[PDB]
Design an enzyme around this catalytic site. Structure first.
Site, PDB file in Angstrom:
ATOM      1  N   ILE A  16       5.355  14.802   1.886  1.00 43.85           N
ATOM      2  CA  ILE A  16       5.496  13.798   2.931  1.00 43.85           C
ATOM      3  C   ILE A  16       6.910  13.214   2.862  1.00 43.85           C
ATOM      4  CG2 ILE A  16       4.559  11.744   4.002  1.00 43.85           C
ATOM      5  CD1 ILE A  16       2.078  12.198   2.003  1.00 43.85           C
TER       6      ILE A  16
ATOM      7  N   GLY B 126      12.173  10.155  -4.216  1.00 44.16           N
ATOM      8  CA  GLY B 126      11.597  11.354  -4.859  1.00 44.16           C
ATOM      9  C   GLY B 126      10.595  12.075  -3.959  1.00 44.16           C
ATOM     10  N   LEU B 127       9.767  12.925  -4.584  1.00 43.93           N
ATOM     11  CA  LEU B 127       8.840  13.802  -3.885  1.00 43.93           C
ATOM     12  C   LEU B 127       7.399  13.281  -4.009  1.00 43.93           C
ATOM     13  N   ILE B 128       6.705  13.204  -2.862  1.00 48.43           N
ATOM     14  CA  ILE B 128       5.363  12.653  -2.774  1.00 48.43           C
ATOM     15  C   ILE B 128       4.478  13.576  -1.934  1.00 48.43           C
ATOM     16  CG2 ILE B 128       5.997  11.177  -0.824  1.00 48.43           C
ATOM     17  CD1 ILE B 128       4.066   9.059  -2.292  1.00 48.43           C
TER      18      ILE B 128
ATOM     19  N   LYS C 144       3.066  11.430  -6.839  1.00 46.19           N
ATOM     20  CA  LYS C 144       4.490  11.159  -6.889  1.00 46.19           C
ATOM     21  C   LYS C 144       5.074  11.934  -8.063  1.00 46.19           C
ATOM     22  CE  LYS C 144       7.603   7.148  -6.582  1.00 46.19           C
ATOM     23  NZ  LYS C 144       7.619   5.689  -6.322  1.00 46.19           N
TER      24      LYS C 144
ATOM     25  N   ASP D  29      11.930  -6.265  -6.593  1.00 47.75           N
ATOM     26  CA  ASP D  29      12.424  -5.459  -5.486  1.00 47.75           C
ATOM     27  C   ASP D  29      11.576  -5.563  -4.230  1.00 47.75           C
ATOM     28  OD1 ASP D  29      14.359  -3.921  -4.209  1.00 47.75           O
ATOM     29  OD2 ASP D  29      13.528  -2.027  -4.955  1.00 47.75           O
TER      30      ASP D  29
HETATM   31  C1  LIG Z   1       5.350   8.523   1.916  1.00 48.36           C
HETATM   32  C2  LIG Z   1       4.362   7.500   2.482  1.00 48.36           C
HETATM   33  C3  LIG Z   1       5.100   6.181   2.743  1.00 48.36           C
HETATM   34  C4  LIG Z   1       3.821   8.033   3.815  1.00 48.36           C
HETATM   35  C5  LIG Z   1       3.226   7.296   1.491  1.00 48.36           C
HETATM   36  C6  LIG Z   1       3.167   6.544   0.299  1.00 48.36           C
HETATM   37  C7  LIG Z   1       1.889   6.728  -0.228  1.00 48.36           C
HETATM   38  N1  LIG Z   1       1.280   6.216  -1.389  1.00 48.36           N
HETATM   39  C8  LIG Z   1       1.931   5.536  -2.420  1.00 48.36           C
HETATM   40  C9  LIG Z   1       1.275   4.826  -3.422  1.00 48.36           C
HETATM   41  C10 LIG Z   1       2.052   4.206  -4.358  1.00 48.36           C
HETATM   42  N2  LIG Z   1       3.392   4.220  -4.322  1.00 48.36           N
HETATM   43  C11 LIG Z   1       3.963   4.922  -3.320  1.00 48.36           C
HETATM   44  N3  LIG Z   1       5.326   4.947  -3.219  1.00 48.36           N
HETATM   45  C12 LIG Z   1       6.097   4.841  -2.033  1.00 48.36           C
HETATM   46  C13 LIG Z   1       6.670   3.647  -1.595  1.00 48.36           C
HETATM   47  C14 LIG Z   1       7.353   3.605  -0.389  1.00 48.36           C
HETATM   48  C15 LIG Z   1       7.465   4.730   0.424  1.00 48.36           C
HETATM   49  C16 LIG Z   1       8.189   4.703   1.756  1.00 48.36           C
HETATM   50  C17 LIG Z   1       9.213   3.671   1.858  1.00 48.36           C
HETATM   51  N4  LIG Z   1      10.086   2.933   1.902  1.00 48.36           N
HETATM   52  C18 LIG Z   1       6.879   5.902  -0.013  1.00 48.36           C
HETATM   53  C19 LIG Z   1       6.202   5.967  -1.216  1.00 48.36           C
HETATM   54  N5  LIG Z   1       3.266   5.574  -2.364  1.00 48.36           N
HETATM   55  N6  LIG Z   1       1.257   7.558   0.614  1.00 48.36           N
HETATM   56  N7  LIG Z   1       2.059   7.928   1.654  1.00 48.36           N
END
Ligand SMILES: CC(C)(C)c1cc(Nc2ccnc(Nc3ccc(CC#N)cc3)n2)[nH]n1
Length: 311
Positions: free
Chosen positions: A21, A22-24, A42, A147
Site C-alpha cells: 500500500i 517504509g513498506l506496508i 510494516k 510527533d
Molecule cells: C498505508 C495506510 C495509511 C493506508 C495504512 C496504515 C495502516 N495501518 C497501520 C497501523 C499502524 N501503524 C501504521 N503506520 C502508518 C502511519 C501513517 C501512514 C500514512 C501517513 N502519513 C501509513 C502507515 N499503519 N493500514 N493502512
C-alpha cells in the site's frame, strides 16, 4: 516482497502478505483468514531503527486487554491506539527484515484535510480530545509520542469513524519504571521531530516529557484551525522556528487569540496552550482539565466532520 510470502512472528503465528500500500502490506493469518484483511504488516531493514522504537512502544503499551480495561474504567467509546499482533524477522535476497503486524487502518488526515490543511473547528477540538485520551494512556505507560501531526492521524478501517495516533517512531520512554528522566539540554541533539510542530524541549535537545506532547498537540490544533502557523515561512530554519514558538508561548493568550480569522475563535486553543505551558518538566498534565477546555459544553463526541462546503 511477493504476495503470498509467509512470515512467522516471534510467537510462532504465521502471516501471509497481501498487496503493498517504509513498506506496508495487507496481511492475513494463515489460520482462519477472513475474506477481508483486518491486519497489515510494516516492514523495514533489521537495522531500520524507527521500526524498533515502534516495536518497543507497541509491545509494551498496546496490550489489547489492558486497553480494554482502561476504556471500560474511563468510559471511553474507544482509544485511538492501533492494535499490535506480533513481530519478527524475515529474509529476502540475503538480508534480514524486521516486521510488525498491526491493526489495519484507513486514510491519514493530512490527505483528507481541507483548504491549507484545515479542519472544521468542531473536528479540531474532537481530534484534540481523542489525542488527549491517547496521550493520557501512553503517558501512564511511561511513553511520549513526540510527533503528533495530521500525517500521523489515521481513520480506522474496520471502524472508519474512529481516529488513531500512529507512527511511534520518535516515541520515548520518559519514565522507565517510574524513574522520570532528568532535564538536560543536549546541544548536540537539538531540533528533533517534525520542525513545524516539535516542542521547545525538543528544539533545546531536552529529552521529551509529557508536557512536550501537549505542547505539540496545541501547535497542531492551531495549525488545523487557522491554516498556517506563524513560522510557516521558517520551516527550513529550526532556530527561527524555536524563536517563533518561544514568542508565541511567551505572549499567550493574545499571540493565539489574535492569530485566528473572524470565523473561528482560538479561545479554546489559547487556554489549552496556556495550560500546557504552565507544566513543569516532570509534571503530569491535567488531562481532564484539558479535555474540558476543548469541550466546554460537555457535548457527546460524534462523527468527525471532514466536509469541504464552498471551498
Ligand atoms: C498505508 C495506510 C495509511 C493506508 C495504512 C496504515 C495502516 N495501518 C497501520 C497501523 C499502524 N501503524 C501504521 N503506520 C502508518 C502511519 C501513517 C501512514 C500514512 C501517513 N502519513 C501509513 C502507515 N499503519 N493500514 N493502512
Amino acid at each position: 516482497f511477493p504476495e503470498g510470502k509467509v512470515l512467522d512472528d516471534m510467537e510462532g503465528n504465521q502471516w501471509v502478505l497481501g498487496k503493498k500500500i517504509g513498506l506496508i502490506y495487507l496481511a492475513f493469518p494463515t489460520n482462519k483468514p477472513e475474506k477481508d484483511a483486518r491486519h497489515v504488516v510494516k516492514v523495514e531493514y533489521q537495522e531500520n531503527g524507527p521500526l524498533f522504537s515502534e516495536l518497543k512502544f507497541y509491545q509494551r503499551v498496546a496490550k489489547k486487554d489492558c486497553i480494554k480495561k482502561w476504556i471500560e474504567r474511563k468510559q471511553l467509546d474507544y482509544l485511538g491506539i492501533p492494535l499490535f499482533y506480533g513481530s519478527g524477522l524475515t529474509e529476502f535476497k540475503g538480508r534480514s527484515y524486521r516486521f510488525m503486524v498491526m491493526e489495519r487502518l484507513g486514510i491519514d488526515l493530512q490527505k483528507i484535510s481541507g483548504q491549507n490543511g484545515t479542519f472544521k473547528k468542531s473536528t479540531v477540538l474532537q481530534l484534540g480530545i481523542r489525542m488527549l485520551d491517547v496521550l493520557e494512556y501512553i503517558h501512564e505507560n511511561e511513553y511520549v509520542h513526540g510527533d503528533i501531526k495530521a500525517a500521523n492521524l489515521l481513520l480506522g478501517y474496520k471502524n472508519p469513524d474512529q481516529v488513531y495516533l500512529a507512527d511511534y517512531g520518535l516515541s520515548y520512554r520518559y519514565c522507565p519504571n517510574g524513574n522520570h528522566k532528568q532535564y538536560q539540554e543536549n546541544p548536540r541533539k537539538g531540533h528533533n521531530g517534525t520542525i513545524e510542530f516539535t516542542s521547545l524541549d525538543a528544539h533545546k535537545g531536552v529529552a521529551l516529557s509529557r508536557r512536550s506532547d501537549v505542547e505539540i498537540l496545541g501547535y497542531c490544533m492551531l495549525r488545523w484551525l487557522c491554516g498556517k502557523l506563524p513560522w510557516e515561512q521558517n520551516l527550513k530554519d529550526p532556530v527561527a522556528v524555536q524563536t517563533a514558538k518561544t514568542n508565541l508561548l511567551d505572549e499567550l493568550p493574545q499571540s493565539v487569540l489574535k492569530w485566528a480569522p473572524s470565523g473561528s475563535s482560538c479561545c479554546e486553543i489559547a487556554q489549552f496552550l496556556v495550560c500546557a505551558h504552565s507544566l513543569a518538566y516532570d509534571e503530569k498534565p491535567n488531562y481532564q482539565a484539558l479535555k474540558k477546555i476543548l469541550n466546554p459544553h460537555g457535548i457527546p463526541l460524534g462523527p468527525l466532520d471532514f466536509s469541504t462546503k464552498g471551498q
